[PDB]
Structures are given as C-alpha cells and as structure tokens.
Amino acid sequence: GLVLDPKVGFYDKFILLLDFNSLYPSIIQEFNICFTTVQRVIPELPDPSLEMGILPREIRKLVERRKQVKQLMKQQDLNPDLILQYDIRQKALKLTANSMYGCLG
Amino acid sequence: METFDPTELPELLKLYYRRLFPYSQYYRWLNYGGVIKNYFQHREFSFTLKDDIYIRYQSFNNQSDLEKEMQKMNPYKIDIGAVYSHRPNQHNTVKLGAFQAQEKELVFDIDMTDYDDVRRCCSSADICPKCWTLMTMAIRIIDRALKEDFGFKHRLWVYSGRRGVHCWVCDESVRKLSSAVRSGIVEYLSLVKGGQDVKKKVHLSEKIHPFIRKSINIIKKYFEEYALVNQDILENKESWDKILALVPETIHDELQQSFQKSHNSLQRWEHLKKVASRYQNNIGPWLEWEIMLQYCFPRLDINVSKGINHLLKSPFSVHPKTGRISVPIDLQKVDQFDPFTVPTISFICRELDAIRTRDYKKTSLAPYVKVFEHFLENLDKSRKGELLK
Amino acid sequence: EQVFHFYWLDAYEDQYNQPGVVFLFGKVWIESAETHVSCCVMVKNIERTLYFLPREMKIDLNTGKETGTPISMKDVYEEFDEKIATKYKIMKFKSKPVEKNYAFEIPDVPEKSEYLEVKYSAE
Amino acid sequence: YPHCLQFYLQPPSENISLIEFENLAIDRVKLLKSVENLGVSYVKGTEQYQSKLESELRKLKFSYRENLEDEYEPRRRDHISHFILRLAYCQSEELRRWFIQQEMDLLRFRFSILPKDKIQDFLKDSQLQFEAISDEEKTLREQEIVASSPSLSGLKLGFESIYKIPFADALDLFRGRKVYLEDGFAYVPLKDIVAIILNEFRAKLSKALALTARSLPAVQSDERLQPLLNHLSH
Ligand SMILES: [Zn+2]
Numbered sequence: 065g066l067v068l069d070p071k072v073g074f075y076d077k078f079i080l081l082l083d084f085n086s087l088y089p090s091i092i093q094e095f096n097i098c099f100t101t102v103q104r105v106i107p108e109l110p111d112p113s114l115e116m117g118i119l120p121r122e123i124r125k126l127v128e129r130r131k132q133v134k135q136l137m138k139q140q141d142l143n144p145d146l147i148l149q150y151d152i153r154q155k156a157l158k159l160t161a162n163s164m165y166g167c168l169g
Numbered sequence: 170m171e172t173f174d175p176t177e178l179p180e181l182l183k184l185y186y187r188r189l190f191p192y193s194q195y196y197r198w199l200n201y202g203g204v205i206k207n208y209f210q211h212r213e214f215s216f217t218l219k220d221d222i223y224i225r226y227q228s229f230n231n232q233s234d235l236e237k238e239m240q241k242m243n244p245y246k247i248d249i250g251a252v253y254s255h256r257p258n259q260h261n262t263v264k265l266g267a268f269q270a271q272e273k274e275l276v277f278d279i280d281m282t283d284y285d286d287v288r289r290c291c292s293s294a295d296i297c298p299k300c301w302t303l304m305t306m307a308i309r310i311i312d313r314a315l316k317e318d319f320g321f322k323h324r325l326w327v328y329s330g331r332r333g334v335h336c337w338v339c340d341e342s343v344r345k346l347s348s349a350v351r352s353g354i355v356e357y358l359s360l361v362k363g364g365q366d367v368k369k370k371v372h373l374s375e376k377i378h379p380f381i382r383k384s385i386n387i388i389k390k391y392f393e394e395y396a397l398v399n400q401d402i403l404e405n406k407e408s409w410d411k412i413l414a415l416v417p418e419t420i421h422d423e424l425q426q427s428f429q430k431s432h433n434s435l436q437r438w439e440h441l442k443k444v445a446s447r448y449q450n451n452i453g454p455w456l457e458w459e460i461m462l463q464y465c466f467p468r469l470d471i472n473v474s475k476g477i478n479h480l481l482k483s484p485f486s487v488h489p490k491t492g493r494i495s496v497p498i499d500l501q502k503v504d505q506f507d508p509f510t511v512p513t514i515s516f517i518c519r520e521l522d523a524i525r526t527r528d529y530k531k532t533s534l535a536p537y538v539k540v541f542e543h544f545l546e547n548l549d550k551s552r553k554g555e556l557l558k
Numbered sequence: 559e560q561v562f563h564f565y566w567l568d569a570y571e572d573q574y575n576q577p578g579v580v581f582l583f584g585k586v587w588i589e590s591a592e593t594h595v596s597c598c599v600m601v602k603n604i605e606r607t608l609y610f611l612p613r614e615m616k617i618d619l620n621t622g623k624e625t626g627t628p629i630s631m632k633d634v635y636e637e638f639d640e641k642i643a644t645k646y647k648i649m650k651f652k653s654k655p656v657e658k659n660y661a662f663e664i665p666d667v668p669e670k671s672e673y674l675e676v677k678y679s680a681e
Numbered sequence: 682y683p684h685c686l687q688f689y690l691q692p693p694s695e696n697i698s699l700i701e702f703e704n705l706a707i708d709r710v711k712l713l714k715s716v717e718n719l720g721v722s723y724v725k726g727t728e729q730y731q732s733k734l735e736s737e738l739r740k741l742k743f744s745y746r747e748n749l750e751d752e753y754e755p756r757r758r759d760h761i762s763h764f765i766l767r768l769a770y771c772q773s774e775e776l777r778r779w780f781i782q783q784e785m786d787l788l789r790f791r792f793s794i795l796p797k798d799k800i801q802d803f804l805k806d807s808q809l810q811f812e813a814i815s816d817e818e819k820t821l822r823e824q825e826i827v828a829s830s831p832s833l834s835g836l837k838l839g840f841e842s843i844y845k846i847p848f849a850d851a852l853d854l855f856r857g858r859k860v861y862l863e864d865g866f867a868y869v870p871l872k873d874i875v876a877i878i879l880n881e882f883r884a885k886l887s888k889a890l891a892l893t894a895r896s897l898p899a900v901q902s903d904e905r906l907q908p909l910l911n912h913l914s915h
Pocket of ligand 1: 290291295296297298299300301
C-alpha cells in the first residue's frame with residue numbers, strides 16, 4: 065500500500081479527512097480480478113470483456129445480499145428487534161468481504 | 170444448369186465429402202509443409218451442421234481426422250479461422266487469456282449486396298451475366314494492388330457461392346500481420362464512402378495517387394461494355410436523374426436536354442464527358458472519374474479482413490441455396506470466369522454416379538482443382554526458395 | 559420411516575482414533591420437558607473422495623518417457639485397481655469418471671478435464 | 682548534438698558516486714525543466730528557442746567535446762541522467778506524461794539541428810533496417826512519389842532525401858494513402874519519417890515508464906534515493 069508523506073505541522077483551519085469505502089474489496093470487483101480472470105504463473109488485469117469468475121461471483125452475491133438487507137431496513141411498521149437484527153447481519157456481510165482480500169495476500 | 174434441389178442436399182453432402190472434396194490439397198495448404206510446430210493442429214475451423222446447429226472451435230491431428238470427422242458430420246457450412254497458440258479443440262484446457270489468435274490469412278470479401286444502388290439488372294441478392302463485370306473489376310483492382318502495391322504474391326480468390334468473391338492472402342509474412350495493419354490495407358484499398366444513404370459517395374482531390382489512378386485505368390477497359398450497354402445507366406430520366414445527383418446542380422439543365430435529344434446511354438456518356446469536361450476547365454473535381462468510381466470500384470467489408478480471428482467460408486465448400494461449388498479463381502482468365510457454369514454439387518455427384526482416387530478428375534470439378542494446385546505449387550516454391558536458400 | 563430434527567452448533571472429528579466419523583453437537587426440542595436439551599449426533603461412513611489427473615500419454619515413470627499409447631480413463635483405473643490399490647492396502651472402493659474444473663496454484667493442470675473419482679473408507 | 686541523438690534503450694551498467702548520481706539528476710532535470718519553459722514562452726521553430734535550448738544543452742554539459750572511443754563526456758551525461766530520471770518520473774501518471782512530454786520535445790530539437798544528411802546515417806545504423814534510394818530510382822519514380830504525397834504544393838520533389846521503408850512501419854501513413862507503395866515498400870521524406878520516430882518513441886517510452894514503476898518497490902527502501910523519488914520539485 066502507498067503512504068503519502070505527512071505534512072508535519074499545525075493546522076488553523078479545518079481538515080477534511082476523506083477516505084475510500086472498502087478498497088481492495090471493491091477493486092476485486094471493478095477490475096474483475098480472480099483465480100480465473102487474471103493471467104498468472106505483477107500480471108495484467110484481464111480485459112473488461114471477460115465474465116466474472118468464481119471469486120467475483122461470490123463477492124457479487126456478497127453485496128447482492130447487502131442490497132436486500134439495506135432495503136428491508138427501510139421497511140416501516142417493522143419489528144424493533146429485527147431492527148437490531150438486520151443491523152448486525154449488515155456489519156457481517158461487510159467484514160467477510162473486506163478480508164476476502166486478506167485471504168489472498 | 171438444372172434446378173438445384175435443396176432437399177437432396179443431405180444425400181449429396183455425404184457423397185461429396187466422401188469421394189469428391191480435395192482433402193489432399195486442403196491439408197497440404199493449411200499445413201504449409203509442416204515447416205512449423207502445429208500450424209494445422211492449431212488451426213480453427215467452423216461447421217454448421219444439421220438443424221442449423223453451429224459448432225466452432227474444432228481442431229484436428231492430421232489429414233485423417235479431417236476426413237473421418239467431416240464424413241461423420243457432413244456439414245452444410247465450413248469455415249477456416251486462424252491458428253492459435255493452443256489446440257482449438259482444447260481451449261477448455263487452458264487458462265482464460267493464454268488462448269488467443271496469433272495468425273490467419275488476409276482475406277477480402279466482396280459481395281453483390283454492396284452495390285444495391287448501382288445495378289439496374291439484378292435485385293440485391295442475385296446476379297447474372299449482365300452485372301458480373303463488377304466482380305471481375307473488383308478482382309483485378311485489388312489483386313492488382315495486393316501484388317503491385319504491397320508485394321503479396323500468393324492470392325487465392327474463390328467463388329463465394331452466389332453473389333461475390335473472396336481473397337486469400339497467403340504470403341508467409343502476411344499470415345502474421347497485426348490487425349492494425351490489416352485495417353490499414355483495406356483503408357488504402359477503399360474509396361466508396363457510403364454514408365447513411367448519401368447520394369455522392371466518391372470524392373476525389375486534385376492529386377490522385379497511383380492506385381486510385383491505376384484503378385481508374387482498369388475501370389476504363391470495362392466501363393462502356395458494362396455500364397453503358399449492359400446496364401444502360403442513362404436511358405431514362407429516372408436512371409439519369411440518379412447520375413446527375415453527383416454532378417453540381419448548375420450542370421443538370423444542359424445535360425438534361427443533351428440526353429433528351431440523344432437515343433442511347435453511349436451518346437449520353439460522351440455528352441457529360443463534354444459538359445463536365447467544360448465544367449472542369451473554367452472551374453477540378455474530376456467529375457468523369459468520381460462517377461465511374463461510385464459505380465465500378467469494389468466495396469469491402471472492414472470487419473472481414475480486419476479480424477485476425479474471423480471465420481470465413483472455406484474454399485470448395487457447398488452453397489445450400491444455389492448448390493454451386495465455392496471454386497477458386499483462375500486469374501490468367503478473370504474476364505472469362507463464369508459463375509453460371511460453376512459445377513453444382515448435385516451436378517458433380519451425378520457425374521460420379523454416371524461412372525489412388527482421382528475421380529474429382531472424372532467430374533467437372535477437376536478444372537478448379539488444378540488452379541488450386543498451381544497455387545500449392547507456387548507456395549512450394551516460396552518455402553523451397555525462401556528457406557532452402 | 560423415522561426421523562428427527564435438531565439445530566447444531568459445533569462439531570468434531572477424531573481422525574487418529576475414529577476416522578470417517580464426525581460428531582455434531584447441538585440442540586433438540588422435547589415436548590416432555592417444555593425446553594430444549596443438549597444433543598449429539600454421530601455421523602459414520604464419510605468416504606474419503608479422491609481425484610486422479612489422467613496423463614495425455616502413458617509414461618514409463620522410471621526413465622521418464624512415453625510408450626506411444628494414448629491415455630484413457632480405463633487406463634488410469636487399472637493402474638490404481640492393480641498397482642496403487644494393493645501397494646497401499648485398499649480392498650474395496652468406488653471409481654467414477656467425472657468432469658471437474660480447476661484454477662489454482664499447481665503448474666501444468668487443465669482448468670477442466672476428466673478425472674478418476676475414487677472413494678474409499680476413511681479407515 | 683553529434684552522435685548525441687540516442688534512443689534511451691538498453692540500461693547503463695556502469696556505476697557512479699552518489700555525487701554524480703545526484704548531480705546527473707538535478708542537472709538532467711534543469712534541462713528538461715528548461716525545455717518546458719522555452720516551449721511555453723516561444724515556439725518550436727524559432728531561433729531564440731533553438732538557440733537558448735542548445736545554449737543550456739551546452740551549459741549543462743549535454744552535447745560537446747570528444748574522447749577515446751569509450752568515455753564521451755556528454756554522451757554519457759545524457760544516457761544516465763535520462764534513465765536515472767526515469768525513477769522519479771515513473772510514478773504519477775501526471776509526471777509520466779510530463780516527462781515523456783519534455784523528453785520528446787528534446788529528441789525533436791536534437792533532430793531539428795542535424796542536416797538532412799547526418800540524420801540519415803543515424804537511422805541506417807540505429808534500430809536496424811532503413812534504406813535510401815539513388816537519384817536513379819529517385820527520379821524514375823519521382824512523379825509517382827509526389828502524387829502519393831499530401832497537399833504537397835508543386836511538382837517539386839526537392840533535394841530532400843527520400844527513404845524506403847517496410848509498408849508495415851508506415852501504416853500510420855499508407856492507411857490514409859499518404860505515400861507511394863511498391864511491392865511492399867513505402868517512400869517517405871524526412872518530416873514524416875521523423876514524426877514516425879517521435880511517435881514510436883513516445884509509445885516505447887511510455888511502455889518503459891510503466892515497467893519502471895512495477896519494479897520500483899525494490900529501491901524505495903534505499904535512504905539515499907528519497908530526496909529524488911520524493912523531492913525533485915518540493
Ligand atoms: Zn445482373
């Protein structure tokens with residue numbers, strides 16, 4: 065990972081600290097990276113014309129289910145126990161994914 | 170030529186692919202003398218079988234496989250693709266990205282549905298003696314180039330089956346050309362800028378490059394024989410209204426009375442030859458040639474030659490509709506080439522029934538099989554010449 | 559015939575001592591008590607399943623070269639049945655030819671190919 | 682300036698003092714940062730440009746005095762300097778562009794200085810295959826060469842030397858029917874021949890700046906090279 069040299073020093077005005085949402089997790093999606101997409105033996109991202117492979121097709125569902133859940137959490141006149149339910153089921157589907165990477169490296 | 174009966178096709182096919190096709194010569198060709206690893210074992214071929222089922226990445230070990238599997242599948246269609254880096258019949262075997270097209274001939278396709286606005290004798294999909302001059306012009310126009318312009322030596326034209334003609338650029342250095350260059354080729358050899366139905370589709374500039382000028386020279390020996398007597402391109406106003414649409418509006422009125430008082434296109438062409446000529450001097454655009462162009466110059470399909478992996482109809486195959494054999498061309502006699510006399514698979518299967526194997530000789534298929542041999546011989550030359558020297 | 563339900567939790571296998579058997583712990587419900595109780599279920603006869611990668615050409619492994627004879631599944635079968643089975647003490651087994659993909663870190667291995675599916679007792 | 686036009690191809694195997702290693706870069710940049718200015722305040726065809734340009738090329742010692750076969754002072758400076766400054770400018774795709782941009786504005790100048798003659802020798806020799814045609818084949822096919830050429834005014838096929846290249850290498854020009862082709866050969870002048878050089882030069886350079894990054898992780902570790910990687914414009 066890259067590290068940009070920190071501008072040691074004080075700050076009078078505000079400092080907006082932006083970030084990315086689940087980086088390598090998404091990247092393994094963006095560039096269809098997989099055990100059946102990439103050419104290996106720092107290879108080259110296959111072409112955007114190749115279809116998903118096992119790995120993306122399991123990170124696919126991984127957010128296809130975070131879709132449903134994020135949407136059922138929108139429903140009202142709903143069980144305030146299922147509120148706390150859906151919330152966790154969220155965080156999980158989240159963790160699993162991210163480490164999907166830590167799984168390969 | 171008797172009516173080709175397309176219900177007999179399933180019968181004739183197994184008899185033709187059994188005893189009349191040139192397997193010996195087809196191998197010897199795509200094999201290119203085993204000068205290299207697996208140039209045939211890595212060559213792709215495509216077959217359209219029964220019910221219209223379309224299979225593709227076929228491949229074989231030797232001349233023998235070719236027969237068994239082609240006498241055991243009796244395809245209606247057959248195509249030759251390119252040679253890849255791994256056995257086509259084995260791409261499931263390899264990783265996805267290491268299997269790729271590396272080499273294929275440089276083929277040019279010229280059909281009749283490309284001049285659907287220049288002919289006044291046939292419908293888009295048909296042909297006859299009267300407009301076939303268009304395939305002969307395309308022939309010496311590009312064959313001319315490929316040889317003169319680029320130095321491509323082994324060009325094999327074949328009969329497409331009903332309304333066009335194909336080219337197989339087989340020089341060793343060509344089979345390995347990058348697609349990018351192949352596009353450059355067609356770009357060079359292309360002049361009809363047919364937009365989304367634009368009247369004037371041939372614009373020239375004051376300086377006219379060699380090919381352009383050599384081409385116009387070969388569109389001149391056929392011009393009046395075809396356009397003005399066979400086609401009579403300007404016998405009606407409906408007909409001439411169409412050729413005026415290329416010339417500058419201010420010229421019409423004068424030509425319109427010029428052909429009104431004339432009595433056949435031959436005199437009507439000499440007429441614009443003047444008016445326009447007179448147009449040129451005081452104003453040039455070369456009005457005389459731009460029209461001979463938009464009417465006589467070949468129109469190719471970029472997608473065909475561009476793709477180094479494109480499946481194109483295999484020589485000596487059989488056309489399901491007309492039945493005719495897709496025969497190689499004899500460039501020593503281009504202008505004598507007859508699409509109408511080309512052997513019918515029905516007809517050739519009749520000539521073997523009215524009868525170490527050479528029975529292809531006993532059929533009228535034989536004459537086209539020799540032009541294919543002179544081809545294999547001129548190639549033997551190259552290998553021999555170029556290598557053993 | 560007869561059957562019961564139960565939500566599990568953990569499990570365990572004793573390869574050393576009891577191979578081909580795994581224990582599923584969990585919970586079962588019992589009307590008689592109006593509360594669920596711990597509950598263990600044993601699973602026996604879990605056959606080891608193996609996959610053999612046929613070669614494209616039969617090879618004399620000693621020297622290291624072909625014999626001119628192409629390979630078929632029946633070829634592999636009889637190599638296990640007669641030369642590998644005995645040497646390693648395998649009396650009965652199950653062999654079935656099947657199509658199987660692949661895409662990991664072993665050089666010279668087809669992403670797809672027919673293999674020799676062999677299954678035999680964990681013992 | 683002299684046999685000073687060189688395709689920065691094939692890596693320097695020498696070795697230097699962290700004093701030369703550091704000075705080759707600071708300097709090699711000062712130049713490249715002057716190629717940048719001149720292109721901003723003047724134009725690519727002015728004397729001031731050509732002048733000052735070779736003036737610094739001079740002052741920074743990158744085209745001058747000779748020596749015994751091996752050690753050619755400026756030859757060397759420019760060879761290393763470039764490669765070394767491939768490290769620094771390989772990262773940001775905004776530096777890779779800027780680099781290529783100014784290291785190509787440079788090959789251009791070192792070409793704008795040589796006469797239609799010296800540039801010829803450099804090609805024959807350079808990569809590998811190119812040929813010139815005698816005034817026999819030259820004038821024999823003269824008219825046809827001027828017909829295939831651009832809006833090129835007049836019928837004047839000047840003294841301007843003409844070359845014969847593989848049709849394939851001139852794709853960029855025969856595709857538009859902008860040169861004469863014969864039995865698989867194209868005939869083009871200097872202008873266009875050069876642009877093709879510059880063209881293939883960018884594409885190869887970019888290609889490299891690519892393979893420079895990939896293997897950069899194996900040095901960022903070194904302490905002496907932080908001031909280069911990180912601070913050549915801080
Ligand atoms: Zn017709």
